[PDB]
Enzyme design. Structure first.
Site, PDB file in Angstrom:
ATOM      1  N   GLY E  67       1.729  -4.259  11.921  1.00  0.00           N
ATOM      2  CA  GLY E  67       0.485  -4.454  12.650  1.00  0.00           C
ATOM      3  C   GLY E  67      -0.839  -3.560  12.178  1.00  0.00           C
ATOM      4  N   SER E  96       5.413  -3.579   6.459  1.00  0.00           N
ATOM      5  CA  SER E  96       4.702  -2.407   5.841  1.00  0.00           C
ATOM      6  C   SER E  96       4.806  -1.050   6.724  1.00  0.00           C
ATOM      7  CB  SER E  96       3.282  -2.821   5.496  1.00  0.00           C
ATOM      8  OG  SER E  96       2.759  -3.700   6.576  1.00  0.00           O
ATOM      9  N   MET E  97       4.039  -1.258   8.061  1.00  0.00           N
ATOM     10  CA  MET E  97       4.020  -0.227   8.976  1.00  0.00           C
ATOM     11  C   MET E  97       5.370   0.316   9.677  1.00  0.00           C
ATOM     12  SD  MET E  97       2.731   2.507  10.488  1.00  0.00           S
ATOM     13  CE  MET E  97       1.206   2.377   9.317  1.00  0.00           C
ATOM     14  N   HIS E 121       4.028  -3.496   1.408  1.00  0.00           N
ATOM     15  CA  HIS E 121       2.971  -4.084   0.606  1.00  0.00           C
ATOM     16  C   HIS E 121       1.776  -3.179   0.818  1.00  0.00           C
ATOM     17  CE1 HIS E 121       2.425  -5.768   4.629  1.00  0.00           C
ATOM     18  NE2 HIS E 121       1.064  -6.076   4.326  1.00  0.00           N
ATOM     19  N   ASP E 170       3.979  -7.627  -2.234  1.00  0.00           N
ATOM     20  CA  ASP E 170       5.126  -7.563  -1.159  1.00  0.00           C
ATOM     21  C   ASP E 170       6.484  -7.451  -2.015  1.00  0.00           C
ATOM     22  OD1 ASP E 170       2.863  -8.452   0.238  1.00  0.00           O
ATOM     23  OD2 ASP E 170       3.922 -10.135   1.039  1.00  0.00           O
TER      24      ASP E 170
END
Ligand code: AGS
Ligand code: ADP
Lengths: 8, 340, 192, 340, 192
Positions: E67, E96-97, E121, E170
């Site tokens: 997010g 990612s996060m 990514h 990615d």
């Protein structure tokens, strides 16, 4: 002799 | 007095408690070590060495005490608190115990002060018209342990003369099976259980068994049971006895002269018939005994339960010179084989 | 609305919701589409039951048309990690992901209702962007399809080649056929 | 007859690490007995009594201060526990039992039991629950008891009579530990913190002593804990133990004449054998003591369990004049060195 | 709906929600997209556990598709500030996060499920306006990308040059590859 101990 | 020899003799009559025998040899030796040449030390207030036995039912507490009395030279007493009524009531009084000790020592004050004391069923005095066998017994016993001189009439009183026999020099062994003493210890040692992945989850019973639970006991745990802290303070020593071992059950039926197997053997020898018990039948009995959780005392149930048919049918039967008990007999599926 | 029930206990009377009452008996409900929120809730239920008792069987009733794959794989790994045997039952329908969690239950403790239906197909996806990015997401979904077929063969006992042909398109399997296919063990027609 | 300085030294001999507590009990007991010798012969009449209320960690020597005091003072002492206590007529207990306990020391006291001392343990357990026979209700019954009154007591249990004994003269020392009291006083006096970023975390669990905060304790904070202000008003004196220290534990085994290290030393003196206890072995006991969150009370378990093998084999062994204990032995991976 | 459970205690019986029961054992759940509200809720949970016990390890289970970046960085700084070791576990997926908070856990206490999947990514953004404003927002997101790669290398141990090449597009990492990549320490296949 006999103990009648009761609590509510 | 030798700790290596006292342990060798107790091994003949008691099996399955190796750690406890070491504790008794140390405490017993320290008791007499002080009386003969002690209390002549640079440091004051040498702690009185006592013993506090704790174990399950059928753990041989009575046997350990009995084996000590026979071995030991001075006298020994077996004074339970089941009927110990305080304040000189109709049942009994604590003073009689002092009197019974002299009967064993034959009114020898010099020899009676060096005696040993043992009590059974001490859980029953736990504090709860009036209470006679409750917390009152702790108060009378407490004076006996801390130390005090009492008055006992020699020969019961013909004058009103009493004997001021010391009590701080006499040893005391408070021992009895404590029922419910495992749930209290469980709360402290368990310390909860984790729920996540990394935290380990306890099984049905891993460390909650009677064995390995009493060794980590503490004095504060006994206070919640009902005992007085001052009474426990005078007994820093503790003796933890294991429930039983599978191998010991096999030895109890073979090495002791009073084994159950030898008992029933003579019961049939008078009838003109022989009896036999193979080793495959002994080990099978031990598995069923531990499941009952009663000890050696509950061992006769497994024997007579199996030999019920064997003994009932036997008299009518003729030409049965010898009877053999197979492992299957303990299971009960197959009847014992007869030898003609 | 959820009905409330009373569980008569020695201590006293306590009020419980119908879903919480069954949770006390090691029963979890899997309803609707499998998503990140619904999946993360069931995982907490399994862990809670593990701590209460690690030796008692768990029962998982599944009635779902499937959903996200990543949300479902979190449940599958949990069932295999914990020691208790997670019994699975199919009520109403069991789609692609619902079927994977169904067969993933403990061997010998998998059941399907007489009128239940199972459906299996290949993973669904899509992407919009540069050609370089489409190739990356295509290789990833291909690995999942291969991985999902490998595990399906492990629990069903079939060969990997058979699962590949049967999962190329949608395939519905009735309750009797599922037993012959190794997906389940038996059918709970009546209570004996 | 004694003085605060003389009793301070005697108390110091058996207790250490508590300096403020000595001055509190010294002046309190000193002025308390001064009132008994002089009575009310002076212009002043009905000299009021000053009660004592102790608050400190568990196993911090609270009971030792009262026990050692009874030995030097020679007056009767009792150790009552308030956990069993119930609210005027319930299954658990009644307050009447406490009165007889003090008389039980000598069992005959008319003008002698009034000067006695009483100790209470676990006073916080009766905190007023605010959600009662366990809470507030119990405190109301003790108010009149501490303020001084007379209770009928059968001497020795038996007459058709009962003896009256005053209790205004009798001093009371309510001992106990108040866990979690740091949070109540911290937000009030030092700072509201522990949960925020800038707020100080409870990093100094063992690095720093909570005691310093307890020194600033007041009766108003005790009200939030659950006690009744009327109950605290009767106990104006306050004693605050700070903590227990690792180095203190080493001093506890060396400075006191009744240290456990010295008892074993005296045991072997008559035997003709030397004993030793190196500093490298005592520091390890401190870590094991704090690990079990028991303090000095859980000390004998570590010592007796380590010396069980040595004591059992010492009589059997010959030509051994010294014993050396190492840190490794305490862990259990090594055996103590023996010198011939 | 959230099921209710009963925690048997000496004082008495108490009713708790499934999420609150695990919170008592130093367990926090990270579900769904990372936003300002969901992120601010987890921070309050960590602080509450710090005050109760600062010496017990905390466990963070992550199942999220990622997010907002700013919402996630508040959690990362909190984990490093507090003394307790924040153990991280990946369930289902870690974007990612979600991957950045996963690797940010205490060294030696990071795990990944056998079928979990991690994806990394570069930061995403965009702006509409004058050319002068586009240059400002472009420089800002570039600093974050550089900052996020620097921290990723610190916990993963890889070089900054490697993270730059691997995070350009990615990149999916299976559970075995995550261990080889330094992102995690081991895999919790079964309970030993
Ligand atoms: N350690 C033991 N070794 C051999 N036989 C034992 C042992 N303990 C018990 N037994 C047998 O069990 C019988 C009863 O043992 P007890 O010592 O009386 O049991 P107990 O647990 O002491 O009884 P309580 O609980 O004190 S009333 C003995 O006569 C033996 O036959
Ligand atoms: N300064 C000290 N010297 C020797 N022993 C001590 C000292 N302080 C405490 N103890 C030990 O602590 C025990 C008493 O603990 P106690 O004061 O009853 O705990 P609590 O403060 O919880 O009532 C005694 O057995 C005693 O040996």
């Amino acid at each position: 002799x006999x103990x009648x101990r009761x609590x509510x | 007095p030798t700790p290596h020899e006292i342990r060798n003799h107790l091994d003949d009559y008691v099996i399955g408690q190796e750690q406890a025998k070491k504790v008794l040899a140390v405490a017993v030796y320290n008791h007499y070590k002080r009386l003969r040449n002690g209390d002549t030390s640079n440091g004051v207030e040498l702690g009185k060495s006592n013993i506090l036995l704790i174990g399950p039912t059928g753990s041989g507490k009575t046997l350990l005490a009995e084996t000590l009395a026979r071995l030991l030279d001075v006298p020994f007493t077996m004074a339970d608190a089941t009927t110990l009524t305080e304040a000189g009531y109709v049942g009994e009084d604590v003073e009689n115990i002092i009197q019974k000790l002299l009967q064993k020592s034959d009114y020898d004050v010099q020899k009676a002060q060096r005696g040993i004391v043992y009590i059974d069923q001490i859980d029953k005095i736990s504090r709860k018209t009036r209470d006679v066998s409750g917390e009152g017994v702790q108060q009378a016993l407490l004076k006996l342990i801390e130390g005090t001189v009492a008055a006992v009439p020699p020969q019961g009183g013909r004058q009103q003369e009493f004997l001021q026999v010391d009590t701080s020099k006499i040893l005391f062994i408070c021992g009895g099976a404590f029922a419910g003493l495992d749930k209290v210890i469980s709360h402290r040692v368990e310390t909860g259980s984790g729920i996540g992945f990394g935290a380990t989850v306890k099984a049905k019973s891993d460390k909650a068994s009677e064995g390995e639970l009493l060794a980590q006991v503490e004095p504060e745990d006994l206070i919640k049971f009902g005992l007085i802290p001052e009474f426990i303070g005078r007994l820093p020593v503790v003796a933890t006895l294991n429930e039983l071992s599978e191998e010991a059950l096999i030895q109890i039926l073979k090495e002791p002269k009073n084994a159950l197997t030898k008992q029933y053997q003579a019961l049939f020898n008078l009838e003109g018939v022989d009896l036999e018990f193979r080793d495959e039948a002994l080990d099978a009995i031990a598995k069923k005994a531990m499941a009952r959780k009663t000890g050696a005392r509950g061992l006769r149930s497994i024997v007579e339960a199996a030999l019920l048919d064997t003994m009932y049918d036997l008299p009518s039967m003729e030409d049965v010179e010898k009877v053999v008990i197979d492992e299957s007999v303990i299971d009960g599926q197959s009847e014992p084989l007869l030898i003609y | 609305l959820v009905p409330m029930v009373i569980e008569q206990t020695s201590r006293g009377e306590r009020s419980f919701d119908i879903y919480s009452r069954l949770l006390k008996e090691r029963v979890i409900f899997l309803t609707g589409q499998v998503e990140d929120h619904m999946a993360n809730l069931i995982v907490a239920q399994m862990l809670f039951l593990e701590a209460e008792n690690p030796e008692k069987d768990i029962y998982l009733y599944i009635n779902s048309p499937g959903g996200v794959i990543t949300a479902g794989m979190s449940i599958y790994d949990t069932m295999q990690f914990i020691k208790p045997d997670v019994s699975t039952i199919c009520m109403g329908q069991a789609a692609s992901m619902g079927a994977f969690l169904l067969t993933a239950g403990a061997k010998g403790k998998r059941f399907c209702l007489p009128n239940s239906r199972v459906m299996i197909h290949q993973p669904l996806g899509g992407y919009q962007g540069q050609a370089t990015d489409i190739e990356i997401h295509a290789r990833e979904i291909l690995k999942v399809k291969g991985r999902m077929n490998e595990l399906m063969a492990l629990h069903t006992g079939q060969s990997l080649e058979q699962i590949e042909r049967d999962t190329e398109r949608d395939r519905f399997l009735s309750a009797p056929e599922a037993v012959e296919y190794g997906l389940v063990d038996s059918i709970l027609t009546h209570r004996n």
